[PDB]
Amino acid sequence: SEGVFMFTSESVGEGHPDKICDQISDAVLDAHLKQDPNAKVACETVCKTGMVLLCGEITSMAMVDYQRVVRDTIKHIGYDDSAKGFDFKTCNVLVALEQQSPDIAQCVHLDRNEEDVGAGDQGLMFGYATDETEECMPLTIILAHKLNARMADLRRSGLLPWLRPDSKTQVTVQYMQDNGAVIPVRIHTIVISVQHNEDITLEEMRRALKEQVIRAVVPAKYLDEDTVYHLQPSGRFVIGGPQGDAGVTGHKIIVDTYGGWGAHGGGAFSGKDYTKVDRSAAYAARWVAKSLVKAGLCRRVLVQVSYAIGVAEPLSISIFTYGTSQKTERELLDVVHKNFDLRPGVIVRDLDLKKPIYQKTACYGHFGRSEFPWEVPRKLVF
Amino acid sequence: GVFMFTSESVGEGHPDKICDQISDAVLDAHLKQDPNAKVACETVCKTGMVLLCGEITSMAMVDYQRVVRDTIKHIGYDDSFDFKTCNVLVALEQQSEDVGAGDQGLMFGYATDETEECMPLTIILAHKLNARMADLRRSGLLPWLRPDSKTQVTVQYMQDNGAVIPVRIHTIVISVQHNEDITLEEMRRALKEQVIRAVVPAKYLDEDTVYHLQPSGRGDAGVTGHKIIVDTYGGWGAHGGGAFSGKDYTKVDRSAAYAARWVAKSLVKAGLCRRVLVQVSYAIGVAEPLSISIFTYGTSQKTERELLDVVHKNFDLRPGVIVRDLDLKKPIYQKTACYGHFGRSEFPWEVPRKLVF
């Protein structure tokens, strides 16, 4: 075990402006899929000072109360009393969504069996896994997610009632190399900025942050006397969320995925239905990456897949195992070709992607949570 | 070892890139009058409507309508998108050396000695394909071309002790918007001869290369910060989440990422390595970086731990020093908003620092 190195990931809570827009975008997606499971949705949410704008394209036989969808999401996030900084009742909802609803045609809509239909766009997608945690994800991002989930739970239970939904966490971890695999040694640095009420002091918060959040989240084996704790380091932070800075769907794509580990091909997931390869292939690529680690073929893998618009079969598939694989990456390509079919139409069938389960992906990461079908690994015939 | 790798790129007329260009055009307009103007301008576009949203703090007075419409005109949209009939909703809120970072975040710098500009060939070719089509459109040599294009280049590599060397072109994809008065076969032939042959070196091309040209068979919502991989390295290296366009130099998502590239390119150009990934991270209100990490893919002679000492002695990566070194108060950001932020020697972060090692 030769070289020590540091690595940092960040994460944000449900009340961060960008993540509000991700959650609303997928809440809109779920609303359509509950009524029309083949609804084509591309819904970009922007938010600023008690205003929400929905923008993009929809083609659905559903009828959605966008005002209610938006306002429920914001209420659920925690901006339900104005005492928490904002009101979900006073929120402006401008809907600028180009809408169609399928017109009964003499021609059939799909001329193909849906599994053989060509990819809706081009693009690059990445799947990554690492056997350092049980959920096959980097500890840096998993801890950054769990810190936000911890604060959310303590907020909703009233145990720290001064908490407001807008939070941001960053965890730097100290690693050791092990023939291309990576093993967590200690916690280098932790940062937590979080929105608060007026009736609490910085010292109360910082102490409450260390004891009731960090100690509950991070295993004590990883925590040290030399760990740095930058807690509420910006100073005061009362006004945030919708009332704060401008939020947009697709500005937290690294937080959504792997926190710097592996790679990314550009695609924002939230707002987009399952016929968009930016989402479906990326979910499938994770599925492949996690399956290869869970089978014991490797300890750490980065998978790339690419498409062309109108072509069903992937253009290229690449495997990078950081030398932790026993077999060659070329050999492992054969294993993936024989155990998986990565055409978009087969990807939806395998992963059950017509279900309205997307709002839950819009915070705390799209990967690492076994509740989603792409996190349950496939047993491989190798 | 052999392996494949794919990068994509989009043209000036792609909805997302329109919004990136407008966002930085707005940034430049402010910096021409107030060089310390704080700008965070998110542009959304759909069907002849443009919405600007976010925060500004500037003593400049900007004709946002003119800034937006000139940008769209310059991209190539004269008539149906149209710059003359274009709605401009402006919803931008106004407020009011060892300074702390304006936010937290992760940033990555990456370089590779496969091309002269120290970038992956996959992304560089994908960029040049779009730049080629733009030039042929504006000169009238292919007047059927319209500004919205998308290119994807898959390249076949060979490993060389952690460095990567391009062997051949596996696949090329080009989708591009067009006029009604031209046939698919004319376009596809014109795509291969006048674009691809002019862009890609013939040594890399062979008769077993796949050409998916206009494969969709002859406008959607655009947003700033939806082309961040196209903006950077095309899948190679890594990304920390930050969208560059619309944000001024006091935002670390942009300034640190530009500085991290500068470090990454300097280490390759000095001959300390052939390929490197650098990570830097910050905390809000702290000037000095929290962590700095070096990953050389085993192409480095020195240890990555040793190379950390080289970077510590040759660079100061506090945001306030980063702006001074890289001259980031200049209005040069609209040019970064298409064709990649990295690989172009015209920008100060692409000129490498000679290292005392």
Residue numbers in the entry:
A (entry chain A): 14 to 395
B (entry chain B): 16 to 95, 99 to 114, 128 to 249, 257 to 395
Per the authors:
We have determined the crystal structure of the MATα1 R264H mutant at 2.85 Å resolution. The crystal belonged to space group C2, with 42% solvent content. Chain B contains three invisible regions, the N-terminus (Met1–Glu15), the gating loop (Asp116–Glu127) and the Phe250–Gly257 region, while chain A contains an ordered gating loop and the Phe250–Gly257 region shows a clear electron-density map. Chains A and B align well, with an r.m.s.d. of 0.076 Å, and are almost identical, despite some differences in regional flexibility. In contrast, the crystal structure of the R264H mutant of MATα1 described in the present study shows a huge difference in the dimer-interface orientation owing to the substitution of Arg264 in the central part of the dimer by His. The upper part of the mutation site becomes generally tighter (Thr262–Gly263) along the dimer interface, while the mutation site itself loosens. The dimer interface of R264H is associated with 25 hydrogen bonds and nine salt-bridge interactions, while only 18 hydrogen bonds and four salt bridges are observed at the wild-type dimer interface. All attempts to obtain a holo structure of the MATα1 R264H mutant failed and produced crystal structures of the apo form, despite the R264H mutant protein being mixed with substrates (methionine and AMP-PNP) prior to crystallization. The loss of enzymatic activity caused by this mutation may thus originate from its inability to bind the substrates in the first place, resulting from the change in the positions of the residues at the dimer interface, which is further compromised by causing a lower affinity for a tetrameric assembly and a greater propensity for dimeric assembly. Arg264 is also involved in providing enzyme stability by forming a salt bridge with Glu57; its mutation to histidine thus causes lower enzyme stability, as observed by the decreased melting temperature of the mutant.
